[PDB]
Amino acid sequence: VSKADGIIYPQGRTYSNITITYQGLFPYQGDHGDMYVYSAGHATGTTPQKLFVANYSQDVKQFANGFVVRIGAAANSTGTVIISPSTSATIRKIYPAFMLGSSVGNFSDGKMGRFFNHTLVLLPDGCGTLLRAFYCILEPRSGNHCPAGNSYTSFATYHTPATDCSDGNYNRNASLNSFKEYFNLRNCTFMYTYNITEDEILEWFGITQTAQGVHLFSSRYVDLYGGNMFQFATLPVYDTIKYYSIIPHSIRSIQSDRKAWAAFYVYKLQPLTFLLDFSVDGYIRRAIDCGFNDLSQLHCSYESFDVESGVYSVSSFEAKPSGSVVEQAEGVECDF
Amino acid sequence: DCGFNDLSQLHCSYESFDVESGVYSVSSFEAKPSGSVVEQAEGVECDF
Amino acid sequence: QQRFVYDAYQNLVGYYSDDGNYYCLRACVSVPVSVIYDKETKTHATLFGSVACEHISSTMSQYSRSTRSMLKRRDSTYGPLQTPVGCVLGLVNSSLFVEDCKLPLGQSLCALPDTPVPGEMRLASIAFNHPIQVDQLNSSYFKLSIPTNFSFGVTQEYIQTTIQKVTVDCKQYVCNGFQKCE
Amino acid sequence: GSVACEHISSTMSQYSRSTRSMLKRRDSTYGPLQTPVGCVLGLVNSSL
Amino acid sequence: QLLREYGQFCSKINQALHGANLRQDDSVRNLFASVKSSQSSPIIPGFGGDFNLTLLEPVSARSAIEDLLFDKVTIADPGYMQGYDDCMQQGPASARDLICAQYVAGYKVLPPLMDVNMEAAYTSSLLGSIAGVGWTAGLSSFAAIPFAQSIFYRLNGVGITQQVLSENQKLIANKFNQALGAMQTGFTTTNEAFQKVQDAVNNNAQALSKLASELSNTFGAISASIGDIIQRLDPPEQDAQIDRLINGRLTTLNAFVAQQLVRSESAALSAQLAKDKVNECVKAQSKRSGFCGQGTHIVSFVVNAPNGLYFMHVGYYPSNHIEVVSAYGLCDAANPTNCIAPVNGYFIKTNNTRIVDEWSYTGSSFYAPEPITSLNTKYVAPQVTYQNISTNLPPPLL
Amino acid sequence: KAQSKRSGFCGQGTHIVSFVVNAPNGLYFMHVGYYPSNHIEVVSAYGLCDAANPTNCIAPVNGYFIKTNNTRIVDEWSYTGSSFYAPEPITSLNTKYVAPQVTYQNISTNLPPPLL
């Protein structure tokens, strides 16, 4: 938080060269979040065999306030591929895919991770050029290796860099078609699309929900070399989202041509009180989580980043109730 | 008449017909809005 | 027969149990916390009210409070120090003496920051500056202590004589021009 | 107050306040006087 | 959460209290920096000589009279150390223990800036410099004279001649010891200063008790316990009741802070008065009546008290007044422009079964006729009220 | 407007002179005081009497009778000011006649001029 990580800008206004306390939806200072990695698929020489994904589709989490995501942190660095542990490569920024809903259940064989009547889906396409969001009710298809079919492991999307990610024309439906192989989009609703210009810069992406729909945030269109997150969309979703999950994505690249995709981190949001420092150009370069420790509470009490030396009374520890004790009666006893 | 002028307001504040000598703060003048300014983002027309 | 024993201010302080015993009832007690902070070195220690260091732990997992975490308290992490004012965390027993300190802990105690990575603060004590001792003679003479050098010194002192004179325009402050409010 | 006498006039028609009228300020009615404390109306520079 | 939207009220209270405590510490430091002497004599046993001031001497660190004063005052012992574990057992409560209530109510009593031993060191060092304050311009020099010498020099300066002091040495010492000894049996209900000490302690206790008492108040709610209304109502009305309690408690805290500010501001003026009294009555003999004590001031002592200083002013109280006839001055009848006036005394008419219309000298504060000499007279210009004496011509007029 | 004889009221040390200027909301005082240092200890007498005439005694005025060590006659008595150590001869200007006391020194030789 000392460098304003995952801070959603106050979405009504702006300030200049001041420091104020603000109540919003921020993440915990020092929070580690959940890490997710995307990997290339199995390939023998010049023929991709299958998809390599984790069990993310089985792991369903609670939404309950929304979250923020840190995309492209470990870029321009030397890391390793997932399916080839002894293979160094330069890491490339990749974008996450989410599927959120209001009701969850089991798949064909009781496998966890099925979304009922209406399921919002956010999935990038065009080999990292656009993002599409849609309700598009999911219908599991019956076939080989498919959700409603036999021998089902996990649904996943994919794209082939040999054909789809072409410099002349980036296939803007490859990932949508991959998603279509497992589910039949039925009774669908708004299907938007937003344009992303390629780079290798760290960026942020957030999502919340209010009475006016599902709000989408990002730091690409306003602050790019910063990270302050501004709203850029609102969705006609008005069902109260209770659950969400990640969508696995494998890259069907050549065994001799494989890259490393940077892992992305997801951090939950909570209704906290922060101390924000707005600079002259109005950007938040530093903040303080008022409930992290005692020094933070001191800083927020004086609402300054410099507190004079001294001895300060702070909040005290309270004993935790160890057990419980009750006392009562019968009603007389029955007379057999 | 309490609202006639400043001396009347002084007389009514002390509710007496004799006010001691001195320098008294009274009600101030306010600038009058000369114009108006409107700003919006509309443009909806009908399709004949 | 009236099992509940109260006190003057309607607090339960006793109970006659069904087992045939009388139990005093207390309230669960909080552990007071304070932070000793040096700014120009960004150093901090924790003082625990008037507790005896047996009830506190490096994690304080048996207690609960709204603050999410304790102060960092890096590699040093020795046992809690017991002081005349209470149990302190992040202080090293120094056995030094000072004439004055910027952060007095209480009763004679000071936190001496490791001023020129700054180290942990030290627990020093304020020392009494003894005046020049002159002994009495047992004769018709007496010992006299007299200066052989001197200097001049300026003592500065401010005495306030006025406050700023301010009048408010009550009607305008309350209603700010709006005829309806008038 | 602390006004420089360029913003005030004998009628103060560009402002508004609840008080209905100003003080009488009879035949003398010379220009506003500028003082170190502000613009004053109804004073004669005396140099006493 | 409900209080979180009330913003910076709690922070305001905390900052005000922190500033008041800082000012209290600064006042203590200033007072004891102006109380300390630069030179003093060690307090050995028997310090005082014929004057028994052993109740001012420190028991090997507080004095005996200081210990008596602290013992006779009903003051609750604060913890300052393992006082949290003392209330863990606590037995039955002792008439609303306000020391165990701080860990319940949510306030805390901070220890005083200095130890008992350091304060006693300051007071004892002040006691050792009393005799040697210096008869001559006594600010930059220290003369280590005995206590008896200082007392006799103070007595000589109020109008008692050296002859009387030399004659009544033991009687004076016994009379001083009688006055200082009645002090041990003095701390009772009739003692006004002791009652003031108890009033200050009771004011402290009342300030704490008001905070501890408002937690049982139910500010127009169904209960005073938050955890009780939580398990009996539902969010829409739970919020209203909890907000009633929150507003009541915030008002209580604001009132407490304002009263503490008033009391702290009064105590700084009182500390300045104590500084003036230490500089004027303890480190010097004062010539202004009524400031130090009653009668004529001679010497003052000071010890520590629960929340300040306790001064003991020793004064000279005259009794058994008689009326005599005195002259403004004496002139030589043969040479009328040769006249004398008494110095720190009076010219009285003797009746020592001797020559008629004899003139003697007496000190201004004790009746003891003595011969007229150049040591107790001074030459002056003639006045119409001076007595023109022809015979017996005291030696200055010869 | 005066030099004050009461310690602690004007400033620290011994007051000599004070200045006052205006400040934002009051007055600003600058008290110049005399601060002594480098104290030494000497032996001093309450007073001096003539051994031949015991009822002829003197006491110092605004100073002290000290024992000199100016490589000179033994048991010589000098006078010094109360605020600065500088031995000087004893004369009628810095002494005053007083009644004898049991603590006074009975001098036999070298008899400072007042006692002659």
CA distance A44 to E376: 130
Q: Convert chain C into a string of H (helix), E (strand) and C (coil).
A: CCCEEECCCCCEEEEECCCCCEEECCCCCCEEEEEEEECCCCEEEEEECCCCCCCCCCCCCCEECCCCCCCCCCCCCCCCEEECCEEEECEEEEEEEECCCCCEEECCEEEECCCCCCCCEEEEEECCCCCEECCCCCCCEEEEEEEEEEEEEEEEEEEECCCCCCCCCHHHHHHCCCCCCC
Q: Which residues 6+ apart lie within 8 Å of E167 measured at CB? A: none
Resolution rounded to one decimal, in angstroms: 2.5
C-alpha pair distances (Å), E159 with each of E163, E172, E196, E298, E345: 12, 15, 34, 12, 7
H/E stretch holding B9 reads: helix B6-13
Task: Quote the tokens at residue E20.
Answer: 């008041």
- Those residues whose C-beta lies under 8 Å from the C-beta of residue E284, and which sit 6 or more positions away, are E133, E138, F6, F7
Helical H runs in chain E? 9-35, 64-72, 83-89, 102-105, 116-128, 147-156, 162-167, 169-181, 192-213, 226-230, 235-277
Q: Which residues of E touch C51 (CB under 8 A)?
A: 82, 84-85
Q: Which amino acid is at E256?
A: F
CA atoms of C141 and F75, how far apart (whole Å): 13
- Helical spans, DSSP H, in chain A: 174-182, 294-301
Query: D17: which 2 tokens?
Result: 């306040």
| Distance from C-alpha of F14 to C-alpha of F33, rounded to nearest angstrom | 5
**Dihedral over Cα of D1, D2, D6, D7: its sign:** negative
What angle is formed at CA F52 by the lines to CA F50 and CA F54, rounded to 5 degrees? Answer: 55
Q: Which of C131, F98, F45 is nearest to E149 (CA)?
A: F45
Amino acid letter, A10: P
Residues 6+ apart with CB under 8 A from C53: C79, C80, C81, C82, C87
DSSP 3-state of E350: coil
CA dihedral sign of residues A7, A11, A15, A19: negative
At A12, phi and psi to the nearest 5? -135, -20
The token pair at E331 is 């002139």
A177 contacts: CB under 8 Å, gap ≥ 6: none
Tell me which residue in A21, A301, A310 faces E14 most closely, judged by beta carbons.
A301
Helix (H) or strand (E) segment spanning residue B10: helix B6-13
Q: Closest approach of chain E CAs to the CA of C83, in angstroms?
A: 8
The DSSP secondary structure of F17-51, one letter per residue, reads EEEEEEETTEEEEEEEEEEEEEEEEEEEES-EEES
Determine the distance in angstroms separating the CA of C103 from the nearest CA of chain F, rounded to an integer: 26
Q: Is A23–E18 a contact, with Cβ atoms under 8 angstroms apart?
A: no
Q: Are E52 and E64 in contact (CB under 8 A)?
A: no
Q: Which of A196, A245, A249 is nearest to A220 (CA)?
A: A196
The Cα–Cα gap between D17 and E353 comes to 99
Structure tokens at E154: 């103070």
Residue B12's H or E segment, with its range, is helix B6-13
Name the method of structure determination. cryo-EM
N residues, chain D: 48
Question: Is A20 within 8 Å of A276 (Cβ atoms)?
Answer: yes
CA dihedral C131, F87, F68, E147 (to 10 degrees): -40
* C41 closest CA partner among C122, C124, C126: C122
Q: Which two tokens stand for residue C71?
A: 């102060």
For C87, left (φ over 0), alpha (ψ -120 to 50), or beta? beta
C-alpha dihedral over E95, E99, E102, E104, to 10 degrees?
-50
Query: What is the DSSP secondary structure assignment for residue B13, as one 8-state letter?
Result: H
Contact list, E108 vs chain A (CB under 8 Å): 313
In terms of DSSP H, where are the helices of A183-225?
none
Cα(E51)–Cα(E149) distance, rounded to whole angstroms?
11
Q: C81's torsion region: left (phi>0), alpha (psi -120 to 50) or beta? A: beta
Q: Which residue in E40, E41, E68, E25 sits closest to E303, CA to CA?
A: E68
B28 with D19: Cβ contact below 8 A? no
Q: What element of type H or E holds E49? A: none
Amino acid at E232: R
Does E18 touch chain A if contact means CB atoms closer than 8 Å?
yes
Q: What's chain A's Rg over C-alpha atoms?
A: 24
- The burial class, CB within 10 Å (0-12 / 13-18 / 19+), for E81 is buried
Task: Give CA–CA dist E40/E131, Å, rounded.
Answer: 9
Q: What are phi and psi of C26, to 5 degrees?
A: -115, -175
Distance CA E131, CA E53 (A): 13
Is A119:A100 a contact under the CB 8 Å cutoff?
yes
Contacting partners of chain A (3+ CB pairs under 8 A)? C, E
Task: Specify the residue for token string 């099925």.
Answer: A114
Residue D37 CB-density burial (10 A; 0-12 exposed, 13-18 middle, 19+ buried): exposed
From the list A301, A310, A316, the residue facing E11 with the nearest CB is A301
Q: Are D12 and D21 in contact (CB under 8 A)?
A: no
Provide Rg for chain E, Cα atoms.
32
> For residue E13, what is the nearest residue in chain A, using CA coordinates?
A301
Residue-wise DSSP of D1-44 = ----SSS--SS-TTEE-SS-------TT--PPEEETTEEESS--
Q: Encoding tokens for residue E146?
A: 């005995």
DSSP F46-85: S-EEESSSTT-EEEESSEEEEE--SSSSTT-EEEEETTEE
**Both tokens of residue E356?**
């008629």
- Cross-chain residue pair A319–C103, CB shorter than 8 Å: no
CA–CA distance, C131 with F12 (Å, rounded to integer): 16
State how far the Cα of A319 lies from the Cα of C60, in Å rounded to an integer.
Answer: 10
Q: Which residue of C has its CA nearest to D17?
A: C177
Q: Other C-beta atoms within 10 Å of A197: how many? A: 7
Report CA Rg, chain C. 29
Q: How far apart are CA A42 and CA A49, in angstroms?
A: 5
Cα-trace Rg, chain D: 12
Strands E330-332 and E339-342: antiparallel
Query: Which residues of chain E make contact with A313, given a CB cutoff of 8 A?
Result: 14, 17-18, 108
- Alpha-carbon gap, residue F43 to F78, rounded angstroms: 11
In B1-48, the residues whose Cβ lies within 8 Å of chain D are 3-7, 9, 26-32
Contacts 24+ apart (CB under 8 A), F3-6: F6/E279, F6/E280, F6/E284
B/D touch flag: 3 or more CB pairs below 8 Å? yes
Query: B8 - beta bridge partners?
Result: none
Give the integer Cα–Cα distance in Å for A113 and E318. 105
Assigned token pair, E237: 């009305």
How far is residue A104 CA from its own chain's centroid? 18
Contact criterion met (CB < 8 Å) for F8 and E279: yes
Sign (positive/negative) of CA torsion E174, E175, E177, E181? Answer: positive
Integer Cα distance of C158 and E90 in angstroms: 50
Closest CA to F65 of F84, F88, F83: F88
CA distances from A33 to A69, A72, A227, A264, D21 (A): 9, 15, 17, 10, 70
Burial class (CB in 10 A: 0-12, 13-18, 19+), E307: middle
Q: Counting one residue from A and one from C, how many pairs have CB atoms under 8 Å apart?
A: 93
Residues in chain C: 182
Strands D38-40 and C12-16: unpaired
For F114, which DSSP code?
A: G
Under DSSP, is residue E151 helix (H, G, I), strand (E, B) or coil?
helix
Of A28, A18, A13, the C-alpha closest to A303 is A18
CA A160, distance to chain mean position in Å, is 24
Reading the block at residue C129, the tokens are 């500056």
Q: Which residues of A139-162 are buried (b: 16+ CB within 10 A; e: fewer)?
A: ebeeeeebbeeeebebbbbbbbbe
- In the B/D pair of chains, how many CB contacts fall below 8 A? 35
CA nearest neighbour of E285 among E57, E127, E131, E123: E131
Cα Rg, chain F, nearest whole Å: 20
Report residue E162: phi and psi, to 5°: -65, -30
Asked whether E72 and C77 are in contact (CB, 8 A), the reply is: no
Touch between chain A and chain E: 3 or more Cβ pairs under 8 Å: yes
Which of C3, C69, C71, C123 to mutate: most A Cβ within 10 Å?
A: C69
Provide the shortest C-alpha distance from residue C31 to chain A (in Å). Answer: 5
CA distances E285 to E308, E365, F1, Å, are 22, 16, 25
What is the C-alpha separation between F115 and A130, in angstroms, rounded? 117
**Are 3 or more Cβ–Cβ pairs between B and A shorter than 8 Å?**
no
Amino acid sitting at position C40: E
Q: Locate tokens 């300040």: which residue?
A: E308
For helices E192-213 and E64-72, angle between their N-to-C axes, nearest 10 degrees: 50
Single-letter amino acid code for the residue at B28: S
Cα E273-E279-E284 angle, rounded to 5 deg: 135
Q: Which of residues 125-164 of C touch A (CB under 8 A)?
A: none
CA distance E104 to C102: 31
What b/e readout covers E332-349, taking b as 16+ CB neighbours within 10 angstroms?
A: beeeeebbbbbebbbbbe
Q: Do the chains contact at B27 and C169, CB–CB below 8 Å?
A: yes
DSSP line for A82-146: SS-SS-EEEEE-----EEEES-EEE-TTS-EEEE-S-EEEEEEETTTTEEEEE--B--BPPSTTS
Using a CB-CB distance cutoff of 8 angstroms, which residues of chain A are in contact with residue E4? 23, 273
- What is the residue whose two structure tokens read 């109380």? E35
Report in angstroms the alpha-carbon separations of E234 from E224, E240, E246, F49.
Answer: 16, 10, 17, 100
Interface mutation vs chain A, best among C41, C42, C65, C68, most A CBs within 10 Å: C68
Instruction: Report d(CA A233, CA A221) in Å as an integer.
Output: 12
Give the SS3 label for residue E354.
coil
Measured in whole angstroms, the distance separating CA F58 from the mean position of its chain's CA atoms is 14
Positive or negative torsion for Cα E283, E287, E288, E289 = positive
C-beta atoms of E275 and F8 within 8 A = yes
- 3-class secondary structure, B2: coil
- The reply to whether residue E42 touches residue C133, judged by beta carbons under 8 angstroms, is yes
Nearest in space to A300 (alpha carbons), one of C33, E14, E110, C30: E14
The candidate with the shortest Cα–Cα distance to B34, out of A109, D16, A150, is D16
d(CA C173, CA C182): 11
All residues at 6 or more sequence positions from E216 whose CB lies less than 8 Å from its CB, including other chains: C9, C10, C11, E224
Q: Which of E358, E11, A82, D15 is nearest to E3 (CA)?
A: E11
- Residue C29 contacts A where some CB pair is shorter than 8 Å: yes
Quote the tokens at residue B32. 């009058």
